[PDB]
């Protein structure tokens, strides 16, 4: 019915930041908007209503603007509280969300450590090999990992997981596991992770021979 | 100015259905005098356990 | 203040159904309508059904209409969500929520959310874990820095638990959400960095436990 | 099927009281409420109180609140009016009704009335009706037919019978409504018209019958 | 306290007529109201409520209609057992009854037969004198009766009594009485009851000399 | 068909408050926006007040803005019209109207007219006529034909009757329209033609009447 | 999915009045507006009346303003038309439809209509109907090819169905859709071309069934 | 009162066409307008809104376009079950349709067969006579029918009856009933039916002798 | 007519508790819901609670809710009141009252008041008053006139009554209202006036009476 | 929490004056409005019900008027009876009391007679001074009081009382308590008040000196 759309997807700030981000809908929704909170692995927790009415108990650093279909919501000063997800919501006809801002903290560039794992002789005599390509400490989160078996790139048989942002450092954590049957591991000898970022001005590549 | 004083009348004709969900606090709080004044045939028909 | 407590969640097959509460405290549950909203990773937020303060009026999504149902028992002061026919994309967290007071003629939305309970939809038995070690070696070292790890692999349901050393060591565990794969067995990844001058002579083990199968596996990892 | 039959209506004197009841027959009684109503020339129907099936609500006009008090004694199916300090304008026909069987949540009205009780509230006293002819002469005579007749005047309570030749004489023949006077006293008309050609021949005696008070006069009309 | 009203307060119509009355409310009632027959000297019946819905065993020829403050009963075809008097009534907010309309059997215009009666020698020796103008099988009930003393109309000293419909031709017979001291009646000479009626081209004029 | 039916006009002191009320029937009154139009001998007509059908709306004149408030009472189909601190220049009558219905573009007025209520304002008190015979002589004769009549002059408030004869005479007469005087005093004459040579033997009585005093005077108007 | 049955149509009298009742399934009937929709083949479709989803608006067209009156019973999920004073253009088939679901500003119609009741308004008596042979010959042959047919003459109600040889013969059957006559009586052939070298020796008979009047024809159709 | 008007009120179209059809309103109504199907003894359906909104599960290949005054349904590729009647409705001030457009399956021209009976001697017993002509599988609908009673024409005294298209070959069949009192129809000898069609060069004549 | 008494109401120290009644008669009490409403002269008048005539639904002031428990005895007919958690603010006069009779559709209020019951919240112990005397001289007289008195400082709580001769000196006398000091003892001054010829000569005897400590003090002021 | 806010907060009227108070809501409220007197010492009783509605017993020269968010009540002719003090209450969303307005005698001016009391020797024993400054018998209410004391101004140690309307002659009287440490108090040596009142051309001030 109504379309939502949050900009942008992720904001990297810092404490003390004027954050301000957007929301559209498809069409007309008048003043029908709200604004939610959400911190990780917790329940979401009411903000602004009527597009600019302050809920009680929220501090007056938030604050909200908009009409039609254009809607802004501004942090003054980001506090060490506020880093969490953001959702705006129409009510003007039935309820529908965007897909959530999340506020992410600005640090320094941190290049990623790259390590790699060869699947354990139990796991191979399990009949499945499953090789895992690490990038440990590293911001910001957008890097790019490639498997690459004896020069060729794989596509369709990796899974990426990535953790959220370290409490000591604000640095992410990627791990990347690339899954073959025992027959296929061992139709090869060469395998790669080759991992880019912005902090690396060549590509890293790990890799290993099978058997080895 | 001289707008329309009348209904559309093609308006909506079905709920909001955003409309109010909760219980209005200034409702009837008076016993409606027209209501069901007979004994109700689905009622409690055994003994309660707690009576005297 | 306002409380709002959610049970019955869990893992059910497709097709089969299952029967969601939520109970309220902190407030005059009779006197405010709710709402039942899923959160689940692919859809992100997304409203499922809403109930006035009586029951007169319900409504609901055009992906659940037919299926779901949404009820009360003012006298439990109680919420229910009975869904039936269920499919793998119905898998998400629940939530009841409960409506704001406004005015008369405004528009509702809510604003105290529940705890939330996690339904996940899935034809997948109950299946212990594989622990299998992610062994340190010279291509895993840089400088006096190593690091080693855990794979827990082919698991179901939700959730494992994965510890080092009963606990003792945690500075640089670095455990990664699980993911679902093709087969609907989750699988994850923990990990740590070590003094390279330690390798061969501390002993590291990975204790996992998975409470839904009573399944406790202690993995020793060894460098090679 | 259902009955109803009231009884305790007669005449009284302002200030004093008096008690109606309605006995029920034909259905169960003790599970419906009932409606006392009364009707007047004055002001038509009007509703006077209602009790529910186990007397715990009682409601009453806002004319007659705090001077009548309705009850029922279900033991002996019995519903009951009691009536103080009666004022002048409550002389009505009363009857008992009986609320009608609906839905839970519909608004309730009488289905089956009684049959009704006179209540005439009067100060005046019991008093034999003065009898006067009505002779017919060339002033009341048009054509072939003249019209003769009796007054029956200043009596009270009410009611009178008129009769012309003890029954026998019935074909045209109109007894008035009676009307009640400023002096309280009730006063009526009973008319006859027969051929001019029998007048000073055929005898014409109007009897008049009060049983209140036992009076019976057979007064003769004669022409003039 | 809600007024009803009913339209017309007095409706002559005929066997096999269409039949439809009127019932208004002061203020909005919704559904709740009933519609009651009575016939004279009898109890009440219940015929319809909730507006529309017929009672168990009234026939099929009356219906009615209407919601909110306006509300109407038709009878299709009218039959002899219908000449009664009905009333509606209210109950949204306690009970109102209407005024209650009554369906007159209709005929052909019939004028009225009149005589006067002089008050009788032994009334006049009581201390009283009623002289009686008697209008005798008329139709429709609607006609007026002025008393004349000595070409003086008179006012506040008559009372008037009607018939109800005779059953074997639907005319009506009207009464008035004339009540006067004997002092009152001795200081004139010449009393006269004037008759008027749709039915007469010309009023009627009965009167008498005193004595005579 | 459409009907409107005002009422609770009359004579108001200046500086006190009214309420004028206008029952619809005939159409759907809450679907349809209402006017409030005056029409006096002095301005003519003159549009007064404008609401909404839901009442969201309200206009009113220049020369009333701050003191008239329109409201209306769609739960009981009624139009008001509260006028406070009213001036002498208000005397008129007041119609309640209705907008016609049209396109959505459209500018809108009204098409039915309600019936009218009066509304004087005056400080005058409530006074009978003075009833002076305008007495017929050789100067009121032209040929077979002269003229009498009667002066009904200073009396409070309007309206009052004229009759000649109790009524038995009138053909040839003529009451004029009445005019309001400096004093706030209302005055009027009514003349009849009679045939000359009926003079001194035909009574002549004028029957003035006077409802809001109860005032009824027969003057005998003699030749001199 | 939706659903809709209209029930209560028939053959009426005109003067008299009539029900019709739209039963709604597969949707919450109580929030949501309903239309009123006739179709005739002398007037088309053409709209008759809509109801808010509270009963709160209703409107008409202007050739049954007054006479027809929209209702509905959210707790039974039912919709009324009471139809009093019918003509005899109100013959049509009366579909229920339910308003779609749209913006708050937007105008709106119909987006589900009912399976529809046919109200047929005539002065005609129920009669069964006439059946005359078609009989082949001469001069209905052209070549190898002859026409038969019967003629269904007179009838009312409808409908009245028409088989061949007990239904063993539909190849090549044309039953023509039934014309009302000035009569007010229903008329329609129905037709069969056979090959004319099978004529003298098959039998062909037309089987006329007519079930308001119970009636059962079987005409045989024989050559000249 | 809103006119509405289609056209064309009939188009022969064939399977795979680009059907475009129009319908106009006697004032502005916007976009306020909608496009219905009704197929032969079943109910309409809805199948654009706003002039250019497609209703859910309806087919791509239809659209439609148009505002104020004008509007235009498009049908890009004709389907046989699209063969129905397609109604326009303004509902910009109540509510009304326009005649309705059929969309007819172009064929080849075929000419009518034509057959002719008389009146039974028991419906002539019975007062009455029924003269009927029948044209079997034509195509296309247009055609004339004349009545000639002893080479005069007649007017008022018929009635035509037409079937819809046969599913079989898409033609149509038509009756003619001429209806004539028994004196009336033995008042006279020669009964003809003359009939005209696209696929005919000269006129086809039945008739009858009464008594042959 | 219909009649509330408030009962229970004192002093009580800040954090306690405290239990208010309302007796109800003159009029049904178990067909109307009740409110509870104070006024403070620090806030004015300030709504507190609400009940149903069942006690299913209940409403409290924000600055109230959680500490505060409306309740009600319908087979008493008593209104109830308990106040937990008192804070120094919850100092006022409370009354309950009746919601008037009206539409269903309608909002409601209060149409009858109770006679109200003080409530004090203070930590304060109870204590007898100081009194001083007022001493008139010359630089308390103008012309004719001098003015003496009586201050009453330092007492709780309240009230004190004041006299002058044993109340035979009413005339020009002005007791002021008390104030409450920053120690919470309340303080007033009492003054009269009086001839300037009298001084010396005409006792002058100001008696201060407190019930709740049964304080009697009759302190004489005499010039300097 | 819909605020309410009545003026003027006091108003000086006469018997016979046509009184108008207004009421003005902070959101709109529709029709639901009540006023509500109440007499000093007693319990508030209805006055208006629904914004215009009068309430049985309640007399016709009351009467409502307004909508939306302004609303006044008007007295067409003031009575003795109706001084007394007049709330509105919204009833639209839970129940908000406005401010009050007091409707006050009104009568010629009077100027106030000033008298001043010093602290007795029993208080100078107990601890505490009271120094008492007495206005009696002045018309309108407003006034102003300054302590100086040794021509310094006192602030935050004094407390007033007035009295309400004397039931006599209207007039008002006021007191004036001023409060001091005995060692405060005995720092000084002047104590006067100093007293402004729109009947008084130049300001009052009475004053002694400590120990005279």
């Known amino acids: 019915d109504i379309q939502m759309t949050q900009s942008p997807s992720t904001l990297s700030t810092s404490v003390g930041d004027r954050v301000t981000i957007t929301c559209?809908?498809?069409?007309?929704?008048?003043?029908?908007?709200?604004?939610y909170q959400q911190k990780p692995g917790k329940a979401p927790k009411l903000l602004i209503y009527k597009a600019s009415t302050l809920e009680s108990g929220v501090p007056s650093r938030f604050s909200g603007s908009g009409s039609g279909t254009e809607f802004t919501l501004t942090i003054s000063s980001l506090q060490p509280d506020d880093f969490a997800t953001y959702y705006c919501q129409q009510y003007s006809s039935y309820w529908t969300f965007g897909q959530g801002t999340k506020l992410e903290i600005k640090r320094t560039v941190a290049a990623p450590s790259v390590f790699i794992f060869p699947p354990s002789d139990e796991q191979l005599k399990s009949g499945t090999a499953s090789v895992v390509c690490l990038l440990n400490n590293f911001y910001p989160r957008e890097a790019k990992v490639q498997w690459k078996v004896d020069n060729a790139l794989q596509s369709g048989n990796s899974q990426e997981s990535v953790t959220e942002q370290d409490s000591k450092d604000s640095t992410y954590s990627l791990s990347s596991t690339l899954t073959l049957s025992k027959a296929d591991y061992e139709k090869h000898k060469v395998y790669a992770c080759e991992v880019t970022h912005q902090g690396l001005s060549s590509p890293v590549t790990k890799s290993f021979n099978r058997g080895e | 100015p001289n707008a329309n004083p009348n209904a559309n009348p093609n308006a909506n004709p079905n709920a909001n259905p955003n409309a109010n969900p909760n219980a209005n606090p200034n409702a009837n709080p008076n016993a409606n005098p027209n209501a069901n004044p007979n004994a109700n045939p689905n009622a409690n028909p055994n003994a309660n356990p707690n009576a005297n | 203040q306002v409380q709002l407590v959610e049970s019955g969640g869990g893992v059910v097959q497709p097709g089969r159904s299952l029967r969601l509460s939520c109970?309220?405290?902190?407030?005059?549950?009779?006197?405010?309508?709710?709402?039942?909203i899923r959160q689940s990773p692919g859809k992100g937020l997304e409203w499922?059904?809403?109930?006035?303060?009586?029951?007169?009026?319900?409504?609901?999504?055009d992906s659940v209409k037919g299926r779901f149902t949404i009820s009360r028992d003012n006298s439990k002061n109680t919420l229910y969500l009975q869904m039936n026919s269920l499919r793998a994309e119905d898998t998400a967290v629940?939530?009841?929520?409960?409506?704001?007071?406004?005015?008369?003629?405004?528009?509702?939305?809510?604003?105290?959310?529940?705890?939330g309970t996690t339904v996940t939809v899935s034809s997948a038995s109950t299946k212990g874990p594989s622990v299998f070690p992610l062994a340190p070696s010279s291509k895993s070292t840089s400088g006096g820095t190593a690091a080693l790890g855990c794979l827990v692999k082919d698991y179901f349901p939700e959730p494992v638990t994965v510890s080092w050393n009963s606990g003792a060591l945690t500075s640089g565990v670095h455990t990664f959400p699980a993911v679902l794969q093709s087969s609907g067995l989750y699988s994850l990844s923990s990990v740590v960095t070590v003094p390279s001058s330690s390798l061969g002579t501390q002993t590291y083990i990975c204790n996992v436990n998975h409470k839904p199968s009573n399944t406790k596996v202690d993995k020793k990892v060894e460098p090679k | 099927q259902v009955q109803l039959v009231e009884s305790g209506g007669g005449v009284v004197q302002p200030g004093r009281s008096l008690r109606l009841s309605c006995?029920?027959?034909?259905?169960?009684?003790?599970?419906?409420?009932?409606?006392?109503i009364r009707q007047s020339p004055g002001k038509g129907l009007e509703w006077?109180?209602?009790?529910?099936?186990?007397?715990?609500?009682?409601?009453?006009?806002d004319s007659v609140k705090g001077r009548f008090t309705i009850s029922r004694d279900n033991s002996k199916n019995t519903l009951y009016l009691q009536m103080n300090s009666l004022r002048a304008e409550d002389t009505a026909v009363?009857?008992?009704?009986?609320?009608?069987?609906?839905?839970?949540?519909?608004?309730?009205?009488?289905?089956?009335?009684?049959?009704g009780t006179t209540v005439t509230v009067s100060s005046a006293s019991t008093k034999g009706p003065s009898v006067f002819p009505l002779a017919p002469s060339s002033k009341s005579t048009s054509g072939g037919t003249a019209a003769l007749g009796c007054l029956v005047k200043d009596y009270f309570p009410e009611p009178v019978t008129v009769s012309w030749n003890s029954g026998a004489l019935t074909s045209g023949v109109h007894t008035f409504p009676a009307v009640l006077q400023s002096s309280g006293l009730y006063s009526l008309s009973s008319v006859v018209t027969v051929p001019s050609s029998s007048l000073g021949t055929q005898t014409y005696i109007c009897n008049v019958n009060h049983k209140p008070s036992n009076t019976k006069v057979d007064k003769k009309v004669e022409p003039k | 306290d809600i007024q009803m009203t009913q339209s017309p307060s007095t409706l002559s119509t005929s066997v096999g007529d269409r039949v439809t009355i009127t019932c208004?409310?002061?203020?909005?009632?919704?559904?709740?109201?009933?519609?009651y027959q009575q016939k004279p000297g009898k109890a009440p019946k219940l015929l319809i409520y909730k507006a529309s819905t017929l009672e168990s065993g009234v026939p099929s020829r009356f219906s009615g209609s209407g919601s909110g403050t306006e509300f109407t009963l038709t009878i299709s075809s009218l039959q002899p057992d219908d000449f009664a008097t009905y009333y509606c009534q209210q109950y949204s907010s306690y009970w109102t009854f209407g005024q209650g309309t009554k369906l007159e059997i209709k005929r052909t215009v019939a004028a009225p037969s009149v005589f006067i009666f002089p008050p009788s020698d032994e009334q006049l020796k009581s201390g009283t004198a009623s002289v009686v103008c008697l209008l005798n099988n008329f139709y429709p009930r609607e006609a007026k009766v002025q008393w004349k003393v000595d070409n003086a109309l008179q006012s506040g000293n008559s009372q008037e009594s009607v018939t109800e419909q005779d059953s074997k031709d639907s005319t009506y017979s009207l009464s008035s009485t004339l009540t006067l001291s004997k002092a009152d009646y001795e200081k004139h000479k010449v009393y006269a009851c004037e008759v008027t009626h749709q039915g007469l081209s010309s009023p009627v004029t009965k009167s008498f000399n005193r004595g005579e | 068909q459409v009907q409107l039916v005002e009422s609770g006009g009359g004579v108001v002191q200046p500086g006190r408050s009214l309420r004028l009320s206008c029952?619809?029937?005939?159409?759907?009154?809450?679907?349809?926006?209402?006017?409030?139009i005056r029409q006096s001998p002095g301005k003519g007509l003159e549009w007064?007040?404008?609401?909404?059908?839901?009442?969201?709306?309200?206009?009113?004149?220049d020369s009333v803005k701050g003191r008239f408030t329109i409201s209306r009472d769609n739960s009981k189909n009624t139009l008001y019209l509260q006028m406070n601190s009213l001036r002498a220049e208000d005397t008129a009558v007041?119609?309640?109207?209705?907008?016609?219905?049209?396109?959505?573009?459209?500018?809108?007025?009204?098409?039915?007219?309600?019936?009218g209520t009066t509304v004087t304002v005056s400080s005058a008190s409530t006074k009978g006529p003075s009833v002076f015979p305008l007495a017929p002589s050789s100067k009121s004769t032209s040929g077979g034909t002269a003229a009498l009549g009667c002066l009904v002059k200073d009396y409070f408030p309007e309206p009052v009757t004229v009759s000649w004869n109790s009524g038995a005479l009138t053909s040839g007469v003529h009451t004029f329209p009445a005019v309001l005087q400096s004093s706030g005093l209302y005055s009027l004459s009514s003349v009849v033609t009679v045939p000359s040579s009926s003079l001194g033997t035909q009574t002549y009585i004028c029957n003035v009447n006077h409802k809001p005093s109860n005032t009824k005077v027969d003057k005998k108007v003699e030749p001199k | 999915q939706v659903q809709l049955v209209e029930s209560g149509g028939g053959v009426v009298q005109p003067g008299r009045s009539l029900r019709l009742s739209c039963?709604?399934?597969?949707?919450?009937?109580?929030?949501?507006?309903?239309?009123?929709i006739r179709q005739s083949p002398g007037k088309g479709l053409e709209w008759?009346?809509?109801?808010?989803?509270?009963?709160?608006?209703?409107?008409?067209?202007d050739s049954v303003k007054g006479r027809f009156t929209i209702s509905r019973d959210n707790s039974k999920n039912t919709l009324y038309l009471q139809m009093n004073s019918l003509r005899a253009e109100d013959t049509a088939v009366?579909?229920?439809?339910?308003?779609?679901?749209?913006?708050?500003?937007?105008?709106?119609?119909?987006?589900?209509?009912?399976?529809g009741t046919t109200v047929t308004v005539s002065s005609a008596s129920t009669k069964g109907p006439s059946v005359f042979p078609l009989a082949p010959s001469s001069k209905s042959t052209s070549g190898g090819t002859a026409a038969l047919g019967c003629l269904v003459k007179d009838y009312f109600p409808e409908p009245v169905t028409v088989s061949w040889n007990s239904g063993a013969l539909t190849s090549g059957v044309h039953t023509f859709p039934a014309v009302l006559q000035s009569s007010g009586l229903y008329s329609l052939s129905s037709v069969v071309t056979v090959p004319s070298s099978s004529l003298g020796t098959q039998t062909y008979i037309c089987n006329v069934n007519h079930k308001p009047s119970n009636t059962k024809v079987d005409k045989k159709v024989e050559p000249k | 009162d809103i006119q509405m008007t289609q056209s064309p009120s009939t188009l022969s179209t064939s399977v795979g066409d680009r059907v475009t059809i129009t319908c106009?309103?006697?004032?502005?109504?916007?976009?306020?307008?909608?496009?219905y199907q009704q197929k032969p003894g079943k109910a309409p359906k809805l199948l654009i809104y706003k002039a250019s909104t497609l209703e859910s599960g309806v087919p791509s290949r239809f659209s439609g376009s148009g505002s104020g005054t004008e509007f235009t349904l498009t049908i890009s590729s004709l389907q046989p079950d699209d063969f129905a009647t397609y109604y326009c409705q303004q509902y910009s001030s109540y509510w009304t349709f326009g005649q309705g457009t059929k969309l007819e399956i172009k064929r080849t021209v075929a000419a009518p067969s034509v057959f002719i009976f008389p009146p039974s001697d028991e419906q002539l017993k019975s007062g009455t006579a029924s003269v009927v002509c029948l044209l079997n599988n034509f195509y296309p609908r247009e055609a004339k029918v004349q009545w000639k009673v002893d080479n005069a024409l007649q007017s008022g005294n018929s009635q035509e009856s037409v079937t819809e298209q046969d599913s079989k070959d898409s033609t149509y069949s038509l009756s003619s009933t001429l209806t004539l009192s028994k004196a009336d129809y033995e008042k006279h000898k020669v009964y003809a039916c003359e009939v005209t069609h696209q696929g005919l060069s000269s006129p086809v004549t039945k008739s009858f002798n009464r008594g042959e | 007519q219909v009649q509330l008494v408030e009962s229970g109401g004192g002093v009580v120290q800040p954090g306690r508790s405290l239990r208010l009644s309302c007796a109800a008669s003159?009029?049904?009490?178990?067909?109307?819901?009740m409110h509870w409403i104070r006024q403070s002269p620090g806030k004015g008048l300030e709504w507190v609670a609400i009940?149903?005539?069942?006690?299913?639904?209940?409403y409290y002031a924000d600055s109230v809710k959680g500490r505060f428990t409306i309740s009600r005895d319908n087979s008493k007919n008593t209104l109830y009141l308990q106040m937990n958690s008192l804070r120094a603010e919850d100092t006022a006069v409370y009354y309950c009252?009746?919601?008037?009779?009206?539409?269903?559709?309608?909002?409601?209020?209060?149409?009858?008041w109770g006679q109200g019951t003080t409530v004090t919240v203070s930590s304060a112990s109870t204590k007898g008053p100081s009194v001083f005397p007022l001493a008139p001289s010359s630089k308390s007289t103008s012309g004719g006139t001098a003015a003496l008195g009586c201050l009453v400082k330092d007492y709780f709580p309240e009230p004190v009554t004041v006299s002058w001769n044993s109340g035979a000196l009413t005339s020009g006398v002005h007791t002021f209202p008390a104030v409450l000091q920053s120690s919470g003892l309340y303080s007033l001054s009492s003054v009269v006036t009086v001839p300037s010829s009298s001084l010396g000569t005409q006792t002058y005897i100001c008696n201060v009476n407190h019930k709740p400590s049964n304080t009697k003090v009759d302190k004489k002021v005499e010039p300097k | 929490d819909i605020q309410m806010t009545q003026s003027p907060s006091t108003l000086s009227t006469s018997v016979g004056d046509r009184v108008t108070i207004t009421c003005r809501a902070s959101?709109?409220?529709?029709?639901?409005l009540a006023w509500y007197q109440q007499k000093p010492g007693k319990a508030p009783k209805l006055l208006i019900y629904k914004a215009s509605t009068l309430e049985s017993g309640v007399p016709s020269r009351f009467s409502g008027s307004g909508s939306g968010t302004e609303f006044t009540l008007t007295i067409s002719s003031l009575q003795p009876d109706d001084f007394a003090t007049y709330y509105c209450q919204q009833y639209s969303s839970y129940w908000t009391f406005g401010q009050g307005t007091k409707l006050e005698i009104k009568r010629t001016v009077a100027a106030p007679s000033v008298f001043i009391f010093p602290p007795s020797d029993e208080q100078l024993k107990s601890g505490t001074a009271s120094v008492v400054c007495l206005l009696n018998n002045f018309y309108p209410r407003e006034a102003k009081v300054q302590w100086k004391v040794d021509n310094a101004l006192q602030s935050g140690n004094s407390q007033e009382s007035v009295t309400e309307q004397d039931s006599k002659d209207s007039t008002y009287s006021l007191s004036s308590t001023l409060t001091l440490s005995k060692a405060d108090y005995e720092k000084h040596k002047v104590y006067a008040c100093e007293v402004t009142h729109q009947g008084l051309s130049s300001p009052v001030t009475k004053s002694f000196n400590r120990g005279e």
């Open positions: 959101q709109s409220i529709s029709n639901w």
């Open positions: 009940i149903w005539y069942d006690g299913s639904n209940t």
């Open positions: 003159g009029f049904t009490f178990s067909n109307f819901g």
């Open positions: 009252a009746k919601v008037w009779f009206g539409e269903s559709e309608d909002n409601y209020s209060v149409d009858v």
